[PDB]
Amino acid sequence: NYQPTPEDRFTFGLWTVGWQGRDPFGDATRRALDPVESVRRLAELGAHGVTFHDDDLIPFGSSDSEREEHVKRFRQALDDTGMKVPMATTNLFTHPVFKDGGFTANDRDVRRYALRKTIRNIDLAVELGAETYVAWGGREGAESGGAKDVRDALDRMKEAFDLLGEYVTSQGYDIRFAIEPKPNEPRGDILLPTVGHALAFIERLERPELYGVNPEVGHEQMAGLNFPHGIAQALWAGKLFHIDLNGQNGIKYDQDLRFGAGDLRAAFWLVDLLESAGYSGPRHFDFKPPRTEDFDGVWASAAGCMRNYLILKERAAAFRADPEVQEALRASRLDELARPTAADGLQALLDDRSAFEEFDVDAAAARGMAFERLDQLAMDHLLGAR
Amino acid sequence: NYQPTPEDRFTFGLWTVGWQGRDPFGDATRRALDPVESVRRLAELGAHGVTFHDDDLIPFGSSDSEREEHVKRFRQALDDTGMKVPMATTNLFTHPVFKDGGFTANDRDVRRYALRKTIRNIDLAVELGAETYVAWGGREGAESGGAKDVRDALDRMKEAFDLLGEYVTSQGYDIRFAIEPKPNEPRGDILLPTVGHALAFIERLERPELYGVNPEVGHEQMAGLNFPHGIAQALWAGKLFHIDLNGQNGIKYDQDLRFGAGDLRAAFWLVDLLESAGYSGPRHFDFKPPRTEDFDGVWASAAGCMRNYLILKERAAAFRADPEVQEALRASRLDELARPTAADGLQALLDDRSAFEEFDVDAAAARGMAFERLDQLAMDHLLGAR
Amino acid sequence: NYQPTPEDRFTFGLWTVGWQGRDPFGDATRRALDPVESVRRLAELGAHGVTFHDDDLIPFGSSDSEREEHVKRFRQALDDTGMKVPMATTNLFTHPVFKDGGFTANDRDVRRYALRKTIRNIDLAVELGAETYVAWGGREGAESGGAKDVRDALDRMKEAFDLLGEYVTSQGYDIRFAIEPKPNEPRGDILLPTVGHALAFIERLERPELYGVNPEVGHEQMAGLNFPHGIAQALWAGKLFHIDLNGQNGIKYDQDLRFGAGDLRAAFWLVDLLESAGYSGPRHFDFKPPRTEDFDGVWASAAGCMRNYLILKERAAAFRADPEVQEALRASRLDELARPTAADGLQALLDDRSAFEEFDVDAAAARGMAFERLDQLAMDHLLGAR
Amino acid sequence: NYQPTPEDRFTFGLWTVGWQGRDPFGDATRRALDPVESVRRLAELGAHGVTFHDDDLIPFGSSDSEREEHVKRFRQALDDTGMKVPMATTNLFTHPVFKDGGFTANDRDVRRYALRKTIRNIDLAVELGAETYVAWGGREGAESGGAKDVRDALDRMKEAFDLLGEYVTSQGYDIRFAIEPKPNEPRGDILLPTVGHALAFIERLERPELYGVNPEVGHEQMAGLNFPHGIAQALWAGKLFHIDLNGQNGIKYDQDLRFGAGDLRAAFWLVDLLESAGYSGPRHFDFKPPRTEDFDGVWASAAGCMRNYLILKERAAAFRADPEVQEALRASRLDELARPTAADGLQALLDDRSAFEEFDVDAAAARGMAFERLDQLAMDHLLGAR
Ligand SMILES: [Mg+2]
Ligand SMILES: [Mg+2]
Ligand SMILES: [Mg+2]
Ligand SMILES: [Mg+2]
Ligand SMILES: [Mg+2]
Ligand SMILES: [Mg+2]
Ligand SMILES: [Mg+2]
Ligand SMILES: [Mg+2]
C-alpha cells in the first residue's frame, strides 16, 4: 500500500540520510555514509534521484585526481541504479572562511572565492544532468545592526547572481537557478528571509527569467507563515522551480523532520495545491533523521517521507472529486472568486448603480460563507472518515 | 529638550489618538473624539499633519449633505492650525459586508462595492492634498485552506489595483499607492503577509511605478522578521513610499505600542537607516494609546512617539559621526562591502588565480570580523555612555 | 457515524456559539442568541451541558428581580432538555472598571469589588449544580514594566484566592477552583502565563487541595509549548480539574478555532493521553465560530468539535490496541521508562560497577531508539492507513 | 567608566569564552582555550569567578591520574588569581549515549550511568567550593509523541533528583540544586520547559528546600515570555538560587548573545528587579561570542556583558531615586497595589456596601492609570535623557 515508484519523482539530498547527527549541543551518533551506498539504498526504496552540495560528493580540498575518482564512483552508482541528479548546490556555509557569508561577505576576496567555488560546481552539475542549481545563502546576514549595510549587501548579492547568469549564458548551459529563503539560523537574521523577499529580489536581476525560488516547508513556518499560501504566490508568478519538503513544529530552530510530521493539515493543503496546479518538478526531501536513530531508522524515516506524500495525494484527490465537496465549494462561492470583478471595465463599473448607490450592503453582509462545513468535509477526507 | 516642530514631518492617524479602547475582550474605556479636536491637540504637540480612513472622517452611511458638512468642518480645522493631510486610506474591514475581504471577497458584488467605496475616497484624498493612498487588506485572507484559492485571489487583487491605477491615470491625479502588509489578524493568514510579498506582487501590476509599500514596525515583527532589514530592501528597490512607526513586543497580537516601546534597539537601527538614506516622507505613527489611559495619557503617549524618534535620531547621528566608530567600521570591512566584487568582469575573475587556485582560505578564515566591538560602541552611543 | 451522546460529556460555553463576531477590527456579524435557544440547540446536537460567565446569563447591572427572571427561564430550559451546568466562571474583563485587572488591579476598591462580584456568582453556580469554578485572569498583567510590581501582584492574587477558599469552606460548598492560564492578550503579558506557572502558584495557597488548573489548547500553543506535555504534568500533579478544547495555528492572536483544527497531531496525542489516563471531567469547548459564518455555520462548527474528538478517540484506541504498536513500544523501551531507575537504593547504585566503572558507553550509545518507525505507525493510524 | 570589580560578583562559564564556534551548519572558527588561560584572562577583566561542566575541565574518558593533573592545574590558576568557583554542573548532553536523555532516558542503564556521572562531579564541586549545582536537562524530551510517556518521565526525573538530595544529605554537603529550564533545542520539546514548570515540579520532590531554579534570559524568551515577570515569581517563591544572563532576539534558536543585546528594555527591567529585591547570588553569563570573532572579539564581548549590567544598574537606580518618578508611581497607584485587599477579613468584606451595593463602577472606570507617562519617564532614564 502506498509504494513509491521513480515516476513519482521523489528525490533526496546526500546530506539528508547522510546526516551524522552532530547538533550544536552534541557529537555525531552515526558513522558517515558513502555516497555510493546512499544511492543504492535510496534506489531500493523507490526514489527517483539524489542531489548534492559540492562538498558532500568531493571532500573539501581534494586534488584534481581525487576529484575525478569520487565523481567516477558516483557516476557508476547512478548507471547501476537508474537514479538521476536533477538538482545540485554549493556549500558556502560550513568552512570557517564563510563565517560572514559567501556572496555578501564583507571581505572582497572571500566574495570572489565564493563565486569561483560556485562556478566550478555548476560545470559538474551540468555534466551530471542537473536541471536546477539551488543557492541557499545560509551565512548571508548578521547578528548585529552595524555589521552589515543591507543595501550594499543586496548590491553584492545582485552582482553575484548576475555574474552567474552571464556565465551560464556564455557557456550555453540549459540550467536555471533557484534561490532558497530562510529567515534565520545559523545567522541571527538571514538576507532574503522568505519566499516573498526572494521573489521581489529576482525582479531586479539582469536576466530574471533564469531565476526562481526553492521554498522549504520548515523555513517559511520558522516565520509563522502559511506555506501553501507562499507556494501559491510563487506559482502565480511562474517561479516555482523546485521545492523542499519536510516538517516543522512551529517557530523554533530548523527541525527538518520527515515530511508529514509537523503541521499535518498544512501538508495536506500543500499536496492539494501542487497536484491541482500540475507542478512537474522533483518532490525533494530536505530532512534529517533524528539523531536518536540508527541506520535502520534512517531508512524508515526516508520511506515515511514518500509514504506520507502518497497518502496525502490520495486524500486530496478524493476531496476534490467528491460531489458533495464540489457543491460545498459553490455554496462558499469559490466559483465566483475565479470570475473577473469587472470585465466590463472601469467606466462601466463607475456607472453601475448596483455596485454602490443601490447596493444592499445589509443583505450581502447577512450571507454566510459556509466555510466551516467546507473545512469539516476536508477534515473528514484527510482522516478517512468518508 | 527634544521638542518636535512641523518640519520634522510627524503625522498621526485620526484612528490612533481616537481609539476608544474596545478590544476583543472589553468595551470602550474612552469617549469618542471629534476629528476637529484631534487636529487641534496634535497641532499643539508639534505634529505636521493627520491621516484618515474614509469612515473615520465621514460616518458610514452618511448622506451627501452630511458628508459635505463633515468635510467642511475638517477643512476649517486644517486651515486654522496649518496641519496637512499627506496620506489617506479606505476602511475595507470594519463593516460586516467585508467579513471575507474587500478586493478578494468570494462574492463578486462585494468586490465591486469595495472598488467603488475606494474610488470615492481617492477623490476626497486628492481634494485634501494627499500624496499617498494606502491600502491595508486586513480582511483579505482565510482561516481555513479550502475557503480561498490563493491564485484566484491574487488575480482578483491584481485586477483591483490595476483598475485603481487606470482610474488615477485617467483623472490626471498626482497620487501614488502604498500597500501595507500584515501577516495575520484579523484573518488567520492575510494575503501579502510581509514587505517581501508585497514588493514581489507590485512587479506584476500593469503600471508598477505607481505602487510602493507602507511597512509597519509591529507587522513585520509579528513574523519575527528584522524590520530595518526589510526597510533596506524596500529602499533598495525604490519603493518606500510611506512608513508606519510603532512598537511591538515579539510574536503575538498586534500591540500598536507607542514608537520606541517594544524592540528599542530595532528602533535605533531603523532611525539610523531612514536618516542615512535620506527618507523624505512622513514619519507616521499608527499606534494605540493603551486602554488603561484617560485623555491625558492619550496625549502623553502621542508626545512620547515623537520624543523617542528625536532622541534616537540624535544618538544615531552621534554614532555615525564618531571617529572611533568610523575606524571600527573600517576594521570590520564595511568599506569593502561597498566595493564591487568583480568590476573587472567575469572573464578576469575566471583567470584570477588569486581568487581560487592560490587563495589562502586558512589565512582569510582566521581574520576576525570585530563585530562585537562595533556593536558595543553602538550600545554605548544609544545609552549615552559616550 | 461518530455521533455524540450526553454520556460523552461534551460541554460548551454560552459565549462560544453565542459569539456575535465582534473582533478588534470589525463589528458583529451575527445577532445575539438567547441563552435558552443555545441550550435547546446544543441539546439537539448531543451535548451534555453548558457553562457560563455571570454576565453571559444575567446582563451587567440587572436588578434583583430581573436577575431571578433570567435564572428561572434558564433553569426551565435545563429541565426541558436534561442539560447540566458543570462549570461556571466570572466575567472580570469586559467592563472598563477592570481595565487594569480584577484581583490584581492597582486600585484597592476595584480589587474588593472584583471579589464581591465573584462571590455572588459562586452562590449561583452552586445553586445550578456546578462542580468547578474557573478563574481566567485575562486583565491581570501589564503592557509596561513599571505599571505592575509582580511580587505585590502575586501577593494580591494569593490574597484573593485564599479569601475565596475561606468563603467556600465556611459555606460548606462542594465546589473546587480551576485557574486558567494564558500568556498574553488582552494584556501585553498576563500573570500566571502557562500551566506551569499556575501549578507553582497553587502550592503557595493556604488550602492547595481546593485548586487545580483549566488549561486551554490554544493558550499553551500561544507560547509555542507542547500542550499534551503540559497536560501530562498537570495529571502527574493531580491537578487537571477541567480542560478547554479548541484549535490554534501557532504563535499569534488567540484564534479559538473548533477542536481538531489547528495542530491536528497535537489533538491526536491529547486525546490519547486523556483517554489513557482516564480523565473523568467534562470535555469543554471554548471556541469561536468564525465571523464569516451565519447561524447554520455556528451549529456546523459546534458539531465538528464533537465529531473530531470522537474520530481521534477511535484512532488513538486503535493505535494502542495494535499488537504491532505494542511491539514497537517495547522496541523503543517505553517499558523500561516505566521501571524505577534505582529501586535498589542509593548505596547499591554507588557500589554497582556496571553503572559506571564497567559500563560500556559505546555499546549503549550505538542502540537505536526506533522512534521514527513508532511515529510512522502513529501517523498511519491517525490517517486510517491501517 | 563602568569598570567591574570582583565585588560585583560577575561569573562566566568555561564553555562561554571557550566556545570554538561550531554550530549545526559550520565548523569551529577558533582554537580551543586552556581553562587556565580563561581563568587568567577573565580575572584581568574584573570577573569574580568561573563555572564548569565536568567535561569542560576534565576531558571525557580521562584516567584518574590525568583527572588529578587537570584539577591541580586549575586549582593553581584559581590560587594565583583569586577567582572563585560558585557553581558547577554536569554535561549530560554531548556524548551520544545521552541522545535520548540522561535522567529520563528510556534505557534504564543510561539513567543509572547519568546519576553516577553527576554524583562524581558533585564531590568535585564541593571540593572546589561551589555553593550551587545546576542541572540543565537539555536531552530530556522528545521529537515525537509516542517516544516519551511524560508521566513516567516525570517519575524518573523526580526519582533522580530525590536520590541526589539523599546523597548530599548523607554526605553533609552544604550545596543546593538549581534546575535550568529551556523550552526546546536540542530536543523538539524539553521537559520542564519554563520557570513555572520547574517551580511546580520542585514542590513534588521529597526535600523541596534543597532545590531552586536557574532561569536564563534567552530561554524564557524562546517561549515569548516576559523574563522579569518569571524572575519575580521565582523570587516570590523564594527559589531564585542562581541566574544566567545573556541576550536573545525573540522566538528562534538559542542565540546566547552577550547580555544587553537582544531585548534591551527587558534587560533594564531585569536589573531593576534584581537590585531592588537584593538578589545576592552570582551574576552569571551563559553567552557565546559570535563565531565571526577572533580572540580579541571574545574578550571584548565578555567585557561588554559586564559593562552593560553596570550601565543598566546605574540607570535603574536613577529611575527609582527620581522624585518625579516616585510621584508618578503614586499617581499610577503602585502604593495601593502593595496594600492588602481585605485585611479586615472575609466577613467585613461581605458586609461592606461600599465594595458592591454602593460602589460607583463608572467613577472608578473613568480613572486613568497614567501608565504611559510613567513608562516614558523610564525610557528617558534608560536613554540618559534626564
Ligand atoms: Mg531546514
Ligand atoms: Mg532546504
Ligand atoms: Mg498594527
Ligand atoms: Mg498601519
Ligand atoms: Mg482562547
Ligand atoms: Mg478558555
Ligand atoms: Mg541558552
Ligand atoms: Mg544556561
PDB file of C-alpha atoms and ligand atoms in Angstrom, chain A residues 182 216 219 246 254 256 286, ligand 1:
ATOM      1  CA  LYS A 182      15.348  31.030   5.260  1.00  0.00           C
ATOM      2  CA  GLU A 216      11.202  24.822   2.085  1.00  0.00           C
ATOM      3  CA  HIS A 219      11.702  27.640   6.630  1.00  0.00           C
ATOM      4  CA  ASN A 246       9.952  18.383   5.373  1.00  0.00           C
ATOM      5  CA  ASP A 254      15.042  24.405  11.982  1.00  0.00           C
ATOM      6  CA  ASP A 256      13.943  19.231   9.343  1.00  0.00           C
ATOM      7  CA  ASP A 286      15.492  18.100   2.757  1.00  0.00           C
TER       8      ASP A 286
HETATM    9 MG    MG E   1      15.576  23.428   7.021  1.00  0.00          MG
END
